[PDB]
Each structure stands twice: as C-alpha cells, then as structure tokens.
Paper text:
In eukaryotes p97, also known as [name] ([name]), or Cdc48 in S. Cerevisiae, is one of the most conserved and abundant AAA (ATPases associated with a variety of cellular activities) family member. In fact, p97/Cdc48 acts as an unfoldase that couples the extraction of proteins from membranes and complexes to ATP hydrolysis. p97/Cdc48 is classified as type II AAA ATPase, as each protomer contains two consecutive ATPase modules and assembles to a homohexamer with a two stacked rings architecture. The NTDs are essential for the recruitment of most cofactors, as well as for substrate binding, whereas the ATPase domains regulate ATP binding and hydrolysis, controlling cofactors binding and substrate processing.
To this end p97 [name] and UN were mixed without the addition of exogenous nucleotides, and incubated for 5 or 30 min at 37°C. The samples were then subjected to size exclusion chromatography and the fractions corresponding to the highest molecular weight were used for single particle cryo-EM analysis. The shorter incubation yielded two populations of p97 [name]: a heterogeneous conformation within D1 ring, consisting of a single NTD in the “up” (ATP) state and second, a homogeneous conformation in which all the NTDs are in the “down” (ADP) state. Both 3D reconstructions were solved to high resolutions of 3.3 Å and 3.0 Å, respectively. (B) Coordinates model of non-complexed p97 [name] (state III) obtained upon dissociation from UN, shown from side, top and bottom views at 3.3 Å. (F) Nucleotide pockets of p97 [name] state III: densities that accommodate ADP are detected in all D1 and D2 “down” protomers nucleotide binding pockets, in contrast to the “up” protomer where density that may accommodate ATP molecule was observed. State II: Upon incubation of p97 [name] with UN @37°C. State III: p97 [name] following UN release (D1:1-ATP, 5-ADP). Taken together we propose that initially, p97 [name] adopts a two NTDs in the ATP (“up”) state (in D1 ring) (state I), a conformation that is favorable for UN binding.
Author numbering:
A (entry chain A): 270 to 766
B (entry chain B): 21 to 766
Amino acid sequence: NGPEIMSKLAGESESNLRKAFEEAEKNAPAIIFIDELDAIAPKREKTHGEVERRIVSQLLTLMDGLKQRAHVIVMAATNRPNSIDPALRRFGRFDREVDIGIPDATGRLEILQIHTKNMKLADDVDLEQVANETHGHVGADLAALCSEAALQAIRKKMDLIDLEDETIDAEVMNSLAVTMDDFRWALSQSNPSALRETVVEVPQVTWEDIGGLEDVKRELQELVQYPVEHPDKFLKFGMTPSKGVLFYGPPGCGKTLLAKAIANECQANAISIKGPELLTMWFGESEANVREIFDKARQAAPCVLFFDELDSIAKARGGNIGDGGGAADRVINQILTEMDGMSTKKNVFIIGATNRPDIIDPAILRPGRLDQLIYIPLPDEKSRVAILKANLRKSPVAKDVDLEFLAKMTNGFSGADLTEICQRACKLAIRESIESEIRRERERQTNPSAMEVEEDDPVPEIRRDHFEEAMRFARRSVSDNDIRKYEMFAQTLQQSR
Amino acid sequence: NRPNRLIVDEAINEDNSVVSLSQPKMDELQLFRGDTVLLKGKKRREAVCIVLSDDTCSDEKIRMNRVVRNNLRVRLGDVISIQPCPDVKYGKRIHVLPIDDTVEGITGNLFEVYLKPYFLEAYRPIRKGDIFLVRGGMRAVEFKVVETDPSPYCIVAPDTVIHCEGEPIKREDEEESLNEVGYDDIGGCRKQLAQIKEMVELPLRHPALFKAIGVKPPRGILLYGPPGTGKTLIARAVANETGAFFFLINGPEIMSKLAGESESNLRKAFEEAEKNAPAIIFIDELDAIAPKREKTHGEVERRIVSQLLTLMDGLKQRAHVIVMAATNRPNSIDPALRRFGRFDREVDIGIPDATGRLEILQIHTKNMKLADDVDLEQVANETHGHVGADLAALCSEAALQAIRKKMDLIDLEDETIDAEVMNSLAVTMDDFRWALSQSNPSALRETVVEVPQVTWEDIGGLEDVKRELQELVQYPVEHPDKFLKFGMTPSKGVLFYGPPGCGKTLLAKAIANECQANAISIKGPELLTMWFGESEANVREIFDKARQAAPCVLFFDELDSIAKARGGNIGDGGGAADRVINQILTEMDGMSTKKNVFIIGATNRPDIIDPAILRPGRLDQLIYIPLPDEKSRVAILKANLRKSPVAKDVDLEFLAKMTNGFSGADLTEICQRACKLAIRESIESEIRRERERQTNPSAMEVEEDDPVPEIRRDHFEEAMRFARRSVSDNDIRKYEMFAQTLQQSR
Ligand SMILES: Nc1ncnc2c1ncn2[C@@H]1O[C@H](COP(=O)(O)OP(=O)(O)O)[C@@H](O)[C@H]1O
Ligand SMILES: Nc1ncnc2c1ncn2[C@@H]1O[C@H](COP(=O)(O)OP(=O)(O)O)[C@@H](O)[C@H]1O
Ligand SMILES: Nc1ncnc2c1ncn2[C@@H]1O[C@H](COP(=O)(O)OP(=O)(O)O)[C@@H](O)[C@H]1O
C-alpha cells in the first residue's frame, strides 16, 4: 500500500519496499500489488519532496531487479495512467496497462448480484432495473449501495421489532429480507456517485430504437462493421478502410442514436463527447484532454468515438461568419492530431455530429479523417412513422392512436421533436392519471363508509386526445431556411475548397 | 404478551417526574393521569411519578426526561414495567439536601427561593433517593431526598414542613453527569442529525448484532460545512448519547508535535478507540491533517496523511470504530480520504435556516433568563449569515451586554455580589438588537441552502404558470409510480422567460417551499463572478450542494447575465455559449433526474441565451412569465400589501387598472414609494409633535395620539404621480414574438 509504504521514515520506507520485494521473490510465483501507485510514484516534475523521488527510484530499482532475476508479477493501481511517473510505464517495467474502467449496465448488474449473493433479498429487487437505473456508480459504489440497503432493512426491522421482548437470536436475523424500497432509498438519498468523466460502455440503443434512415443505417453498418467484420476483404483490395464519418443535418434527427446503435451492433464501447465537453476543453484552454480521451477510446477497442455537437466550439467562437478569425479551433486541432495519430487497424471509429456543418473547419473534412459526410435528412412520412413506432414502444399507448396520421400532420418534424411530442402528450397522460388519483382520493374521504371502494384504473395508456393536445401545443420543428441550408450543403458536397 | 412492560422514548414536558402515554393504553392498564404510578428500572430501583395520556407517543413507548432516567439508571431503547400506586400518601416532612458542587460559590437562603415555588401546589410525588432538580439565577442545582418521613414514596403538600439543613454531599460514582452533549443541543441540522443517527445507530448501539452479520459498516463520516456549524458538537452529542467512546482528535493537536510524535499520537488514539469499541473517532479540521495531495507541500504532512489513511484502513479491516471528520469543504481534504471504504458517506452539515436559527437560539437561551420581548422568531427571521457558533456568540454578546448594563451600574459600593442579584438578571430585546447590529461578524457569504419562506400566496396571478410548475416539480417527486408506469422520463429543468419583475425568483422560491425542498438561488451576480474570475469549476460544487440537499430546486436567477455581459442582442462577433453556462450544461447532463434536484432558469433576455441550454432533457420546458394583467396585478397588490398596514380606503382594483402593463416588482416598487411616503409622514409628524410642545413649560400636557398607523390612498396617488410605466412596449413585443416562436426555430 502506497500510504503503508511512505507512511514510515524514508529509510524505513525503502527498507519496507526492499523487504516486500525480497519476500515476493522468495515466494515465487508471487504477485506484488501496489494500490495508489500515484502516492508512491507521482509525476517526476511534480514530486516535490526528495524523499518521494528516492522512494520512486527505490521502487524502480526493485522492480528492475525483479525483471533481471525473479518470478514475481507486479501490479499497480492508480486513478489515471498519466498520474504516475512516466518512467514507471517504461518498457520492461510496466509494459501493459489494463484500463479497469467503469462497469456498464450489465457490469453493474453483475456487481449487484455478487454483493447480494449472501444477502437475503426479496423478489421485488429487480436488479436489472436497478442496474439500468444505476449510473455513475462503480464497483465499491455499488457495494456501498448494497450495504446501505441492508442497513436500512436492519434499522427498519431490528430497531422497531426486538426492543424489550428477549435477546436477539438467529431466527430473527435470518428472517431479514431486503426490499425494493431499500434499494430505491439507497439510490436516491444515501449514495454519492463518484463518476463524472466520460462513460465507456456498449450503449443499449439498437437499430430498432431508431426510426427511418435506412440508407444511412446501411451505409454506417458498412463503414463500421465491414472493416472489423471482414478485415480480409479490405486487405485484399488496395484501399485503407475509413476511420471516421461525419453526421450533418438538422438537430433532432438522431445522430447520437446512430452512433449508439452502430456501437451496439458491433458490441463496441461508445464514448460520446458532447458539445459541453468540447466547450469545456476549449474554454479551459486544456486541449490535452483530447489525448487521454483518444487513449481511452483506443484502450476500449473496438470503440466508436462519438463527438456530439462537433461544431459547438465553432459556434461559440462566432456564428456563421463569426469573428474575424478562421474556423480552426484548439480542441478541434487536437482531435485532428489524434485522428492522424490513430491507426485505422485499432478499429476505433470516430463519429462527428454537426448541426452547422458549414461552420466547422474544412481541415476535419480532409480525406483520411472524416472523408465520409453522411447527411442525416429531416425524416419523411415513413421515417416519422418508424420514429413514432420506436418511441412509443416504451410508453403504453392506446391502440386508438394513429401514428401514420400523426406523422402526416407533422410536416418536416425531427425525431427528437417527435420525442418532445411524446414528452407533451405522455406527460399530459401522466398528469391526467395523477389528477384522477387525487380527485378519487378526495371524493370518498367525506363519506364515512367502512366498505366503499370503487377501485378502477382511470387510464393506463395514452389516448389520442393527449396527442391532439400535444399537436395543439407542439408546433413546427425547425425553420425551412435551415433545411434549405442543409440541402444546399448536401448539394455542395463536392466542387468546394 | 404482557402489555405492562414498555419501551423508552424522548419527552416533551419539561416538568420532572412526569410522563405521557398514548390514549388507548389507559384502560389496558386502567389508570388515569392523576394516578401516581411506579416504574421499575435496573440496579433494582423503582421511581414513582405522575402520569398522563397523550397521542404522539406510540402505544409501545413512554416519554420521560433525563432527570428521572438518571436516578432510574436507564437509557433509551431499554424496557420497563409499570404499576399504579393509588396507595400513595400525602407525605409529611421528607428530608432533602443539595447533592453536588453546584453549591460552589453560592450564598443566600436558596431553600425558599429555589424550592417553594417548585413545590408550590405541586403535589409532586417523591420517593427516597430522588435527584430532582431546579434552576434559577443563571444557575441550576439539584437536591436528593435523603429521608421520607413516610416511606418510601409520598406526595408533597403545601402544608408539609421543610426543616431543610445540612451541607452539600457528594454524587456517588453511580451518578451520571449530564454535561455530555445531547441531541437537545443540536439545531439547524435536523435532517443531518437524523442521517447521522441512522448511520451510526447500528454500528454503535448494536456492536455484537453487526458483528454477527457480514455487511460493511459506514466507518468514515465527512461532516463538511462552514466553520462553527456544530460539527464537533454534533459528533460529541452523538457519541455521548449513543454511549460510544468519544476521542477528540484535533488536527492542530495532531500535527502540533513532531512528525514521529504526531504519527505516534495518531496511532495511540486509534488504538485507544479500538480498545474502547464501540468508539467514535472525530477529526475536526481534517483539511489541516489531510490537504489536497497536490497541495500538501511538506513531506511531513504527506506522511501524516498516509499514517491516518493506514490507521483508518486498519480500523476498517479489524475494529469497531466509526471515524468522523470536520472540514470547511469536502474538496479541501485529500481525494484519497473520500475513497470508498475510507470515507464512503459525506454529510453536508450546511447552514441553519430560519427555523434552524430559531432552534439554535432556543438551545442557547435554555439556561438564559430572557424577557418576553425576545421574540426569537423575529430574531431568527432577521438573522442571516449566522451559523451555529455565530448564534452562540450572538447569545453570549446579548448576555454580556445585559450583565454590563446591570452589574457595572448597580452593585458598585453597596455590598459584595450574592446570588440574588445575579439570578435577577434578564435579557431584553435591545440586547439582541445590539448583538445583531454592532457586535456580530457574519461568517457566511456563500450560497444559501434552505427552504424559502415564500409561498404561493406570496405570488399574485400566474395561476396557469403556478399549476404547470406544480406539475413539473411535485408530480415527479410526489407520484414517482405514475411517472415510472409511463415510458417518459420526468423533466429535470424549466426555463422562466419574460419581462423582469414578474416574479420568476418568487416562483422558484414558492415551488421549493411547496415541496419543502431546499432552494439554492444562483443570481446573475454569481454567474458573472464565476465567468469573470475564469472559475467555471464553481458550478461543480454548486451542483454538488444542490444534489446533497435533495429534494432541491436549483434556481439560476438571471441566467442570461453572462450572455448580456458578453454583448447585447448580437453582441460581439462570438457565439452565445459561455464557459459557466457550459459547465451548467455539463452538470445538468451529469445530473440524474431521480435525484429530484430541479433546475430553474430565469432569463430577462431569452433570445440572447445559447440554444444549447434549450435542448430537450435540460430545459425543454420554456414557461413564459407574462406581464401581469388586471387580475394578476390585483393579486400581486393583495399579496404585497398583506405585510404593510394599509388603510381600507385603498382601492387595489382601481390601482391595478391605472397600472397598465406593470410588473410585480414594479408594484412592490410602488409600495416602496407610497409606503415610504407613509413612513416619512409618520416620522415628520412625530418630530413636529415633539418640537411643538417643548416650548410650553407644562408639567402635564400630553395630547398623545397616533398620526397614522396605516397607508392612505393619498400616498398611493403620490406614488402614481411619481412611479411611471413599467417597461417599454418594444420589450413586451419581443417577449410575445419569442413566445410565438417557441417552435419552428433552429
Ligand atoms: N430517427 C430517430 N428515431 C428514433 N428516435 C430518435 C430519432 N431521432 C432522435 N430520436 C430521439 O429523440 C431525441 C431528439 O434527438 P436528438 O438527440 O436531438 O438528435 P441529434 O442527436 O441528431 O441532435 C433524442 O433523445 C433521441 O433519442
Ligand atoms: N447547530 C448548532 N446548535 C447549537 N449550538 C451550536 C450549533 N453549532 C455550533 N454551536 C455552538 O458553537 C460552539 C462551538 O462550535 P463548534 O461545534 O466548535 O464549531 P465547528 O462545528 O466549526 O467545530 C458550541 O459550544 C455550540 O454550542
Ligand atoms: N407576481 C408577483 N406577485 C407578488 N410579488 C411579486 C410578483 N412579481 C414580483 N414580485 C416581487 O416584486 C419584486 C420585483 O420582482 P423581481 O424579483 O424583479 O421579479 P423577477 O425575479 O421575475 O425579475 C420582487 O422582490 C418580488 O418579491
């Protein structure tokens, strides 16, 4: 342990390190594990104290002595690979770095199942739902969640049942059961999520979650799967597979879902860097974050490195013409450098979404980086119908709804505007259910009847009235001038620059 | 199963040897309040007391106070029997004697003054061995009943005699000091106190029970907040009441000595806590011991941090000790400290609200003889920026001012001070006013985290907006099942746009109050401070504070302030996105909706804000706050005038009908004008009345009459002649065209 190592005197710390390495060598085959390696070994320019540098060098010498004559495998734990000394990651010392990363929904489910193996939990736990809901919790976070649920169950049972009856025995403790309410309380009130950085997981969005864009779906399936599913075919021909594609079109057409679905189809991790992240890196003057973003993408091979709102920096630094400056940006420049430095064979695909393709720098459109400019058009009747079918698969909707008619009213409506249509109508249905419940609660409370319960669900689905009200509320998706701009940009895919 | 035994609980009545029980279990035992009843307790002691029937306490639970539980040698959670004793007697002389050093440094015939009024018409049942108590004269003292002429227990009578003599005798080693901090001494952190209770009850009260199971306990508690918010007081009270051994590890005390000596002291403290399991280790000023790892310059400090980490890990692997820590900010301490297993749960002590400040003041004035004009509700409502120990210093300053007014001016050459003069001291409202004004530094300047006092009645009009906001906020949190039933994720944000002065801030405050949710209002000054200072990372801990105060309404007043400082409508050649707005967007994207933390944004210029904040999932609801119409203006005037006394001659409907297109805050400015004119009229009338009769040397000539206690229509007419149109009609047209363009944009 890093704290255990450098907790003692400098000479004592070095002696402890040497003794540990000698014991591991004596007990070969043995594993040396150094958690919090950044504590022992910080960056060489950052390690202020001479004692810390001496400890770093002692560890380096001990591991080199293991390398020359031993049979011990050294493992280390750190928050970031760059937080430790670069000399540690030198070849021969730390050749292979394993990115433990974060657990996905399936991973969180597995962790919860592991922690509930010895926990008597009820049938309402539905750990699939908990894991799907759980975000930002990694490993020990889920362990603390399970511990909190168990402790809440114990405080509900022991603190309220066995007070003066008789001393606690095994019968009462083995009868304890953990319910869904305990897990909900642990999720909501008593769990700090320690994860705030980029998510590295296979997204749950599939092709069925996207409506329309069949040609775009097929083209993206080609450009992604074919290099990775048929490498022999690409190697046979004298063409290097493309390692990037750009999505341009009106906002709300599902470019983010396109990236998520293509990542899911290949079972590849997706790292979606939205416009907020790009603007955070630009405003903070820290373009070097793109370096470890691309490192995370590469370490998660196969990966779909999605850059949502790639024009966010070009939009913050002026509009169409903007200021007197050009279109290149420091974070976009670092992205270009990383993509140029990224091998195509690494099967890490870069997808960029731009709501204003005309404001992005053409340098990102050069062949070899984002040569494919896939246009995501505004959905037509069939695409809108498919989008509505995909969205309504989750919210229970009455069969009286007429999706084809609804699409035919919605002229030039984007997919996310159709999801906002459900936001309106489905929310109206939720409000109707809530108000019906409260009025039903209030109406019979006046009558002092011991047995008078006319129990009936008001409505469990969404009727066409809610959708009509949403139509009366929700209006045209986007301006026609924007659509004309997109269509002229598509018409000018060539004969430019 | 023997509905005679019963379990313990806290008490409300302040009287001693008094109890209260649920209403149904009065026939089960078949005895009424006047029935004097005996109760059993360990070490073979049983004490008789009066009885009562209440409601709050459950059938299975009793209420009583430390005065009785001490002599009973019983603690909470324990269980006791009960038996009526109608055979009690009107006791005669029953000998007593003060049992403490409390008598140290006292004089005067305490007997009468202290006892007779308490024994006045009381019929306080007594049994030998009682340790009853009485307080007065800025002091508190107790006496033991050494003898009961009839035994073992009797009633007191106003006729019974008291030959009370002897000298103060000593507290046997069985007596337990009440000096230990208690939950009664904690105010302003009721939710935090309950969280701490539910965290530490199982590990401490049930050590063997938890040892039976194989769950991981919370062995690291990070009490973070402003200094002086009772963190060490909370820890001491929790440890003392739960019976856990409290070790006060002080950061300055730790690293005051040599590095090796500091590490040895830390190891010895941890070993002693482990030996005294269940024990509580508290480390106040943890940032002193454990700063940020990149910031800890000295190697000795890093070594101490690592030693603390190793000691707490050793506690985690093999011990039964709960570690608590106090720091100004959670990020000020080393991030390795907050690692899972070491400090899993961080409790935000925060700041006390108006009710919390009231509770703190009541706690600090419990032993303070204070007059009836203190009106601590008014003091707490006025008190802002004072947290915990700040209110303690306020009470101390008021008491010291009272003492300097009485002692320094009364007893100078008469005779040496005795108990009679000191117990006659009273604290008045003027002392509290002086403490508030002249002699109190408010140490709080950051964001306020409290439930705002503004309610729906405080807002006039906007009934549709009120209903929509009530839906969007309450329904996700009051009916989660309904939202989960449908396939729609509840919205976690709403944007308020419209002319300034329509009450968007009050809308956020009222929706926070209706849900009883904390409101953190980040105004335009805060946004511009974060933007100009190039510190966008402040939004991170702002959102952390909002999340830790779940349910919370995270209000962003003047969300367009940064977009307005960085140019006007078109502004410079740059875009609309801003670094602080970008950090807000990142935090909202990283904020789970289930966390029931709602973000409300107010923009007086919705057209200048970046559309990226209007994307669905962050602020998809754009609620328009229109300029109030006749009915809305009438309601606004009714809400505002409820505080300022106004004469019934005022005509609010007519006033609203004159005010065409007037905002709510412009109506409050209308009161500013007219109500201020009324105040000035009252002041000038008072001064002219003072000056007019001073010329006549009349011993008795007082034509006392209030000039005007209310506000007449003349003041409002003068305000109308002064106050003019609210806002330009062009702005209203811009707002109406923005509302018309809610869709078909971008
Ligand atoms: N073609 C589509 N089919 C199904 N769902 C869609 C489609 N387009 C968008 N959505 C959903 O509607 C919402 C609005 O889309 P949005 O994310 O704005 O699209 P983009 O990422 O291209 O800007 C998104 O949350 C997305 O999940
Ligand atoms: N919430 C509170 N309620 C009552 N008293 C308080 C509160 N907070 C602080 N105090 C008073 O302040 C005094 C010292 O404050 P302290 O607890 O040392 O501050 P900190 O929390 O910074 O350690 C105590 O004597 C205590 O009576
Ligand atoms: N509709 C209203 N009803 C009652 N009081 C209001 C209303 N609108 C504003 N006020 C009060 O009048 C003052 C001016 O309002 P202001 O805060 O400028 O509104 P906003 O926060 O929307 O800009 C505020 O102090 C507020 O307390």
